[PDB]
Design a protein around this nucleic acid. Structure first.
Ligand SMILES: [K+]
Ligand SMILES: [K+]
Ligand SMILES: [K+]
Ligand SMILES: [K+]
Ligand SMILES: [Mg+2]
Ligand SMILES: [Mg+2]
Ligand SMILES: [Mg+2]
Ligand SMILES: [Mg+2]
Ligand SMILES: [Mg+2]
Ligand SMILES: [Mg+2]
Ligand SMILES: [Mg+2]
Ligand SMILES: [Mg+2]
Ligand SMILES: [Mg+2]
Ligand SMILES: [Mg+2]
Ligand SMILES: [Mg+2]
Ligand SMILES: [Mg+2]
Ligand SMILES: [Mg+2]
Ligand SMILES: [Mg+2]
Ligand SMILES: [Mg+2]
Ligand SMILES: [Mg+2]
Ligand SMILES: [Mg+2]
Ligand SMILES: [Mg+2]
Ligand SMILES: [Mg+2]
Ligand SMILES: [Mg+2]
Ligand SMILES: [Mg+2]
Ligand SMILES: [Mg+2]
Ligand SMILES: [Mg+2]
Ligand SMILES: [Mg+2]
Ligand SMILES: [Mg+2]
Ligand SMILES: [Mg+2]
Ligand SMILES: [Mg+2]
Ligand SMILES: [Mg+2]
Ligand SMILES: [Mg+2]
Ligand SMILES: [Mg+2]
Ligand SMILES: [Mg+2]
Ligand SMILES: [Mg+2]
Ligand SMILES: [Mg+2]
Ligand SMILES: [Mg+2]
Ligand SMILES: [Mg+2]
Lengths: 312, 172, 132, 6, 129, 208
RNA sequence: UUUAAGAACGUGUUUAUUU
RNA sequence: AAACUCCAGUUGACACAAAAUAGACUACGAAAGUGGCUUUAACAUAUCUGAACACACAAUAGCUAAGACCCAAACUGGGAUUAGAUACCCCACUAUGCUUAGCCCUAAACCUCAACAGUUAAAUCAACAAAACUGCUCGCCAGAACACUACGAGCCACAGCUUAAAACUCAAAGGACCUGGCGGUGCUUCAUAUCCCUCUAGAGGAGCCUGUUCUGUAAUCGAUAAACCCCGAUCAACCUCACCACCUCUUGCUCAGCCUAUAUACCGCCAUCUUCAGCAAACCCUGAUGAAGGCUACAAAGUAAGCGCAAGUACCCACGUAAAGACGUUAGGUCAAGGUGUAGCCCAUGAGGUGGCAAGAAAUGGGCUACAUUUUCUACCCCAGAAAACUACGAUAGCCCUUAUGAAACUUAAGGGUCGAAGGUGGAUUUAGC
């Protein structure tokens, strides 16, 4: 337990220690934000522990100590709330207010938004909640929206909705560059297993590819490997129109092709339309393949295989 | 009290008994008001009222309960199943359903007179009704139709021979 | 079951310290190292002699300050120096602490042939992380 | 188990 | 559940309390653990419906008699008044009767609260002079 | 797998994206709009958008590979296609005027038809009933019978009866026989059909 | 209503300032 | 399978046998018992209880005598199953089940709840069952077993029924419940490399390497169903080393020592269920204050610290793999890592030196290499040329030689030469993998 007087004494130690920490580092105590405290505590008390919640921290007591409910009865002993003896005066005072607004409507007559999660509702109510209790409250809110809710009602419902940052699965085009001669090209990078490739694709060419200074058909004797190099250009009907100059390092025979295929495709996205770039994405030409070799375990012959098991 | 360790079971039972307390009425603060005879499940307890100085002649468990209540003198005989938990649940049951002298007068609106051999024929008024005293007497009954106990009748007739009754024991 | 450096749960009446409450799989995630030197770094030498010195120091100080250590030691090496940092209790008299600081600092300097310094931090009672 | 036989 | 809103409003208007929701075990007998050791339990409980939703006596009727709290109850023809201190035999189903009970208890309580403020003011005024 | 359940399999079809919007149905149009949001797996090296890609021949090659040696398995596949091609040209030049109109020289058309002539219609399942096993006829799914045809062709060639005979010449000989509804692989299919007819009364032993 | 399907030695497992 | 095949099916003729539906009715009779149709006769007592001194009845089975015979059927025979099958399954047939005349007189003859009268309030009430009691009367029972037995007596009963003890023996037997476990226990939903089916490569066959078991030797110990078997050992030519033989020392490298007994005295570090999700302090309540138990969300007594899971962190993320994984279970492993309780040795169960054993008739686990043509050799590191069945494919084996390490090598390793064996894809069975 931490009282209100105790918290008030912690607020005074942070303010004083916040002025000392600026005197150490030579900063202005006035314009000393919390971002500068975290940077100065990491220089003076360097900890490389992987868990960031186990490193030295000097924050504001309102962010360290958990929020605690105020006292619910006075000296005489009478509680301050009429729903006290329920044990959930905050949860039921909310359900009573919502159900009272649904009676008024009957009388006188989303992409970014997401319903508040359970763990985020307890903080608002400072109450411990079950799962089935969370669902009941969500059912009234949805029922409130269907009805012709007034302006004041919308503001209430928006206290229990949280915005969502919708990511965009749209490839990032590379900036087209120009060489000394004036030819346009675009550079990208690919990675397959341990192979890493840098590809330079010229805007105009006669379908020539050179890997590490060697023509592609000599560097890749196997037909399968050359098929991979052809896949990006064939899909967009651009065979015999560009000149590629790449450099692949590491990996093996087939891993270097997939690494080159990916770089050529990424750099080929600058000389094509957006609709084609989306098609290349839906075909698996712009995605880095995460399948890498798995480690062997002790007590096993391989990553997943086991030693021969004898029952008797 | 129930628990895995014996020291933890003593606390639960002790601290939980004060919240289930009875109040037992006593005649002159040394014994009960009348003879009690009940049966809790299979366990029979037949307590009797006795005068001062008789002492406690009852089951060792009842001796320990009575001292807690404050009953100095009373006789009790346990029969049937001697189970410490039914013996206790029945003892507290009969000691709470006993009718005092004041309730009896109020019930019948008559004087409760005490007759003692030591005080001769003197009638001692122990309780009188608070309300209107009835003017008519109780109809005298030629023969009462009250169920008797062969154990008590066999003793009054000098027929209950036992080499274990009326033994010299320590003070209780 | 695994047992190394684990304090088995109990009814809830057993106090434990922070270091004593975390197992070996937390040594670089929620704990640090009680000894800090260069022996165990790549290309470095004399990791075996620095270990025998540590084992002896933790026992010398446990029997030199009997019943006074509140938590494990923290050995630190900066070149030739050897810094012993200890958390001790406040039962013993300061007169006797100053005696043992000078007796140990001196005895260990002549044994290991290095300047040795001892840093005490008194606490009223053994700090408790939680109760198991 | 049942005793061994000779 | 039909009259849960009406009752919660009455308690708020008359500065009193209400418990119309699911009654968790130990709200009275084990209160100090749920709320706190210095909690103050009710001195009077008023049952507008002595039954639960499965047509059985409310657990509070028995838990109140354990904690020595007097109970007032509106018992219908299918209820048990044995443990209710001041029972009131009357209909507990129709809405036209529930509004009456609430209106009567809301008034009797509001009067007494104001009746004491007049008695105290007189004593305080008379006491000084 | 290192992919999450959110990742979706890619569509290498090249003529699907080219479809005009006017042809897109209400349901199909919705599908295309959805894929923009979803994540996509990386296309594997096996399949490309080429015009000569044959999924049936890529699967048969994978069933012949041994120890991850795809360069050698694919080498044997093309040699067989070339050997089947040369044998038909030799039979086409030495044929009569009207016999050359019924001689197929495309090895792919021969490979697909040979495997289709080996697919069994029904199979057998050992059902344990009364401490005994029974060969109960069962309708095989479309995939099962396609896999059995491949496995039987590869198993017959791998037989030891053939001595110092290379796989491309063995497989090519079987494909022609099957293409003509001859050879042992077909007999293996007929034997399965003859054992299911004798055990036809045991069909009731099946519950599914 | 739907095959068969045996056997497993004897004891021991809970209190009180220089000068 | 046997049996039948003067069998089967349709139709017609055709009972001394047995009595669908109605019956979801609940009646008759003292009980036993009685369910097709009709007719005759007929179902005691104007208070109750009342015969184990009598009388009359009493399912089925069974005895005696004479008849009938569709079907069923003990017994028996045959077929099958099984380690055996005097049984369960199939076929056939007999006593018997039916009628008539007599006997026999038993039953879980149990609705295990006596007859007549009456009550529903009080203490309703051990538990379970089919709620708890009063009055009156008769009958019956007094620890278990010996014993529905022996003797005696009675009976149309003769291997019988009825009535019915004792000696020796035991300290329990018995009735009803809580919890858990188990079930060749039911219903439903599932398993995802997992149970079945289904996919891929293997093991079990040969040779070699290596461990173990047996045997052998003067010559370690330990692990040794799952959860041992290239395990303690990321390691034994001397050393290591604790074993054997021989010899030697005695306050002994140690303010001694012991790889001596006890892992069924333990710490320490672990295996296992765990490829689980539960453990549980402290309070409350239910069961009449019993062992115990504690949920229904349109909510019916549960609230719960803490541990674990989860969450976090590590590796290339949000995935996956690691790590983690409680309380307990197997007195599971280890006194030979070290430490240590109890016990034991102290001219020896301690210490040191020299030398030496660690093998194979035999069986088996694991692995390696192969039996070849998707192969073998060379170049190359993927557009080649040759080889291809008694000079092929195929030993890391044997033999010989050389070298490396070391004080020490028929012994360890490496290489060369020589040698060219089994083996022709492997029985029942069996392992791993998304
Ligand atoms: K019965
Ligand atoms: K094999
Ligand atoms: K083998
Ligand atoms: K093997
Ligand atoms: Mg592998
Ligand atoms: Mg583990
Ligand atoms: Mg009502
Ligand atoms: Mg036997
Ligand atoms: Mg047994
Ligand atoms: Mg009579
Ligand atoms: Mg009789
Ligand atoms: Mg009879
Ligand atoms: Mg007969
Ligand atoms: Mg017959
Ligand atoms: Mg037979
Ligand atoms: Mg017959
Ligand atoms: Mg019969
Ligand atoms: Mg009967
Ligand atoms: Mg009877
Ligand atoms: Mg009678
Ligand atoms: Mg007896
Ligand atoms: Mg009998
Ligand atoms: Mg007899
Ligand atoms: Mg006789
Ligand atoms: Mg051994
Ligand atoms: Mg052993
Ligand atoms: Mg052992
Ligand atoms: Mg192993
Ligand atoms: Mg040796
Ligand atoms: Mg030696
Ligand atoms: Mg020794
Ligand atoms: Mg032993
Ligand atoms: Mg053990
Ligand atoms: Mg793990
Ligand atoms: Mg976890
Ligand atoms: Mg053991
Ligand atoms: Mg050769
Ligand atoms: Mg050799
Ligand atoms: Mg040499």
């Amino acid at each position: 337990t931490y009282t209100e007087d105790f918290i008030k004494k912690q607020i005074e130690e942070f303010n004083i220690g916040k002025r000392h920490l600026a005197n150490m580092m030579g900063e202005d105590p006035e314009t000393f934000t919390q971002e500068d405290i975290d940077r100065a505590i990491a220089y003076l008390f360097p900890s490389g522990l992987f868990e960031k919640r186990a490193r030295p921290v000097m924050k504001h007591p309102e962010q360290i100590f958990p929020r605690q409910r105020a006292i619910q009865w006075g000296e005489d002993g009478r509680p301050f709330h009429y729903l006290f003896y329920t044990g959930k005066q905050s949860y039921y005072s909310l359900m009573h207010d919502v159900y009272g607004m649904l009676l008024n409507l009957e009388k006188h007559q989303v992409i970014g938004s997401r319903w508040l999660i359970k763990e985020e509702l307890e903080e608002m109510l400072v109450e411990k909640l079950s799962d089935l209790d969370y669902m009941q409250f969500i059912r009234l809110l949805e029922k409130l929206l269907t009805s012709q809710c007034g302006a004041a009602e919308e503001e209430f419902v928006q206290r229990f909705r949280r915005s969502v940052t919708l990511e965009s699965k749209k490839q990032l085009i590379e900036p087209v560059q120009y060489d000394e001669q004036g030819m346009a090209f675009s550079k990208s990078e690919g990675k397959r297993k341990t192979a890493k490739a840098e590809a330079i694709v010229y805007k105009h060419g006669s379908g020539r590819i050179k890997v590490n200074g060697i023509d592609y058909q000599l560097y890749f004797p196997i037909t399968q490997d050359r098929e991979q190099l052809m896949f990006p250009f064939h899909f967009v009907d651009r065979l015999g129109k560009h000149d590629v100059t790449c450099t692949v390092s590491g990996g093996g025979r087939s891993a270097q092709a997939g690494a080159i295929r990916l770089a050529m495709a990424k750099a080929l996205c600058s000389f094509v339309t957006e609709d084609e770039v989306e098609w290349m994405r839906q075909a698996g030409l712009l995605t880095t393949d995460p399948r890498v070799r798995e480690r062997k375990k002790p007590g096993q012959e391989g990553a997943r295989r086991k030693f021969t098991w004898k029952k008797r | 009290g129930k628990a895995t360790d014996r020291m933890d079971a003593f606390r639960k039972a002790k601290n939980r008994a004060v919240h289930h307390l009875h109040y037992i009425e006593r005649y002159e603060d040394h014994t009960i008001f009348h003879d009690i005879s009940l049966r809790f499940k299979r366990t029979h307890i037949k307590m009797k009222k006795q005068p001062k100085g008789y002492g406690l002649r009852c089951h060792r468990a009842i001796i320990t309960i009575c001292r807690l209540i404050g009953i100095k003198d009373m006789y009790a005989k346990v029969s049937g199943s001697i189970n410490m938990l039914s013996l206790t649940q029945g003892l507290f049951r009969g000691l709470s359903r006993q009718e005092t002298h004041q309730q009896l007068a109020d019930k019948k609106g008559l004087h409760v007179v005490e007759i003692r051999e030591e005080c001769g024929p003197l009638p001692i008024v122990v309780a009188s009704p608070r309300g209107p005293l009835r003017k008519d007497p109780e109809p005298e009954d030629e023969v009462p139709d009250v169920k008797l106990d062969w154990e008590d009748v066999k003793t009054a007739q000098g027929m209950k021979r036992s080499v274990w009754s009326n033994l010299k024991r320590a003070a209780t | 079951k695994n047992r190394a450096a684990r304090v088995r749960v109990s009814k809830g009446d057993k106090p434990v310290t922070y270091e004593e409450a975390h197992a070996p799989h937390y040594i670089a995630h929620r704990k640090g190292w009680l000894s800090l030197h260069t022996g165990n770094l790549d290309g470095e030498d004399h990791a075996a002699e620095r270990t025998v010195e540590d084992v002896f120091l933790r026992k010398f100080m446990w029997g030199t300050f009997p019943g006074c250590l509140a938590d494990q030691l923290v050995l630190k090496r900066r070149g030739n120096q050897l810094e012993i940092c200890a958390v001790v209790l406040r039962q013993l008299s300061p007169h006797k602490y100053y005696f043992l600081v000078g007796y140990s600092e001196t005895l260990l300097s002549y044994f290991y042939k290095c300047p040795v310094r001892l840093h005490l931090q008194t606490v009223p009672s053994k700090v408790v992380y939680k109760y198991l | 188990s049942e005793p061994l036989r000779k | 559940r039909q009259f849960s809103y009406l009752i919660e409003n009455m308690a708020r208007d008359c500065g009193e309390y209400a418990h119309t929701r699911y009654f968790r075990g130990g709200m009275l007998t084990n209160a100090r653990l749920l709320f706190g050791p210095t909690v103050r339990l009710p001195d009077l409980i008023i049952f507008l419906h002595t039954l639960n939703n499965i047509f059985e006596p409310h657990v509070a009727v028995r838990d109140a008699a354990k904690m020595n709290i007097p109970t007032v109850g509106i018992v219908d023809t299918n209820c048990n008044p044995c443990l209710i201190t001041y029972p009131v035999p009357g209909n507990d189903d129709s809405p036209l009767a529930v509004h009456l009970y609430c209106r009567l208890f809301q008034t009797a309580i509001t009067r007494a609260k104001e009746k004491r403020q007049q008695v105290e003011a007189l004593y305080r005024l008379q006491g000084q002079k | 797998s290192r992919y999450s359940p959110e990742f979706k399999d890619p569509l290498i079809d090249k003529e699907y994206y080219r479809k005009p919007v006017e042809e897109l149905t209400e349901e199909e149009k919705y599908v295309r709009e959805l894929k923009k949001t979803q994540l996509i797996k990386a296309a594997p090296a096996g399949k490309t958008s080429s015009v000569f890609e044959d999924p049936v021949i890529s699967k048969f090659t994978n069933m012949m590979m041994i120890g991850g040696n795809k360069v050698l398995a694919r080498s044997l596949m093309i040699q067989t296609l070339e050997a089947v091609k040369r044998k038909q040209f030799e039979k086409y030049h030495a044929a009569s005027a009207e016999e050359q109109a019924t001689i197929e020289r495309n090895p792919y058309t021969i490979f697909h038809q040979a495997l289709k002539n080996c697919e069994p219609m029904i199979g057998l399942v050992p059902i344990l009933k009364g401490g005994r096993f029974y060969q109960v006829p069962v309708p095989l799914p479309d995939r099962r019978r396609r896999f059995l045809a491949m496995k039987w062709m590869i198993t017959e060639c791998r037989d030891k009866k053939h001595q110092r005979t290379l796989m491309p010449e063995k497989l090519s000989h079987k494909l022609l026989e099957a293409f003509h509804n001859q050879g042992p692989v077909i007999k293996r299919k007929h034997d399965l059909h003859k054992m299911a007819e004798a055990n036809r009364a045991l069909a009731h032993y099946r519950w599914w």
